[model samples]
Target: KRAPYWTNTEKMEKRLHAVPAANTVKFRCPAGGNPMPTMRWLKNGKEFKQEHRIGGYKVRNQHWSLIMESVVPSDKGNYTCVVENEYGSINHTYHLDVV
Candidate 1:
């Protein structure tokens, strides 16, 4: 480890079922990292399977965001957003309720 073992300033956030039964969910966080943070989205505590779902987007624009469209009951669960730099990672989750 170096003098100050990495920074813990990285952040993440999510909105629970804010959209609709078949709506879009948003995720975001603050920015500022040395090597940049690798961001990801997960559904129900598992990695969001981007390969299977369509219209899924995950990009490291410093401030990470994951948007899911046409949310279904299957999408109703704990949505986790993770930010990880070469040093460490920070994760936060939100519950999705289908109405």
Candidate 2:
């Protein structure tokens, strides 16, 4: 089975920049793995629940995206995209910096 690997290298950075009070931002992470991996998003090491400003938690054709609408200062934190299957698992940690 193929281990999950990031499809977008730019999204692997531990730090991410976001426009302050931006209308929206999408932290996209696409991965490929055997048996079709599943996606889960985390913030500050916990499940990322949906909020008013949080957009769709999309997963389609191995493409995963976490869209944050109306980003505010409180949106700054560690965001992680995890892809896992019976074969293996992988994760990419990202830090959101609003400025």
Candidate 3:
């Protein structure tokens, strides 16, 4: 037999099709190994701002949720959940739409 092969870590079961405007959204991640995964909120594929209105949580099972509080029309785009481990890192993007 030959040596094992490896590749970039891929995120599984990642869905970003349920972004709601004018509301707070929640997020969660899988748990394993040391160095827990970090959850971040972004809009238009950019770093999310940290304000008094916005709230975040790091719950059990490596689940991370972000509350947008007052959602806006512009708050639409790819929302991502990046999971990092000793093996590698994976990112999942979600899209948001307003009615």
Candidate 4:
């Protein structure tokens, strides 16, 4: 019945997150809205598609997440989650330092 907002009131973190290479990285996105939201992820600035080791999906018992099965140097960049519904839109950003 209203615009989208973060359901999990977490730290609106802008700091960089350093994830070891060859390890997994999961960015959880908890959002709630009246019309329900569709999610999209962006890396650096472009759409982050489901490729070799990267994906965005609704976890079986967790919030929607952008997950990297394995990290690499090329994966070091800012990641963003954009959630939108009929009422409004919301976004959260994170910087990943994969090294």
Please report, in order, the local distance difference test score of every candidate based on alpha carbons.
Answer: 0.62, 0.74, 0.50, 0.74
Residues 7-65, model 2: lDDT tens digits: 77766553566677766767777888787788888988898876523453343444587
* Candidate 3 structure quality by residue, lDDT tens digits, 1-99: 121111223332455545456666554444344454444556556766665234432234334444455566655566665556555566556666654
Looking at model 1, the pairs that clash are none
Find the 10 residues in a row with the least total lDDT in model 2: 52-61
lDDT of 2 at 72: 79
Cα-lDDT of candidate 3:
0.50
* Candidate 1 ranges beyond 4 A from true positions: 1-18, 51-63
Residue 91 alpha-carbon offset, candidate 2, angstroms:
0.7
TM-scores for every predicted model: 0.68, 0.79, 0.57, 0.83
Tens-digit per-residue lDDT, 1-99, candidate 4: 888888875744445689888877778678888888888888777887756234333332246677776678778888888889999988888898977
Where is model 2 more than 4 Å wrong at Cα? 11-14, 51-62
Q: After aligning candidate 1 to the native by TM-score, how far in Å is the CA of 79 from where it should be?
A: 1.0
Give the count of colliding residue pairs in each prediction: 0, 0, 1, 1
Global fold similarity of model 3 (TM-score): 0.57
How far off is residue 9 in model 3, in Å? 15
How accurate locally is residue 49 in candidate 1, as Cα lDDT from 0 to 100? 83
Q: Identify the leading candidate in terms of TM-score.
A: 4
Kindly indicate the candidate among 2 and 4 with the higher TM-score. Answer: 4
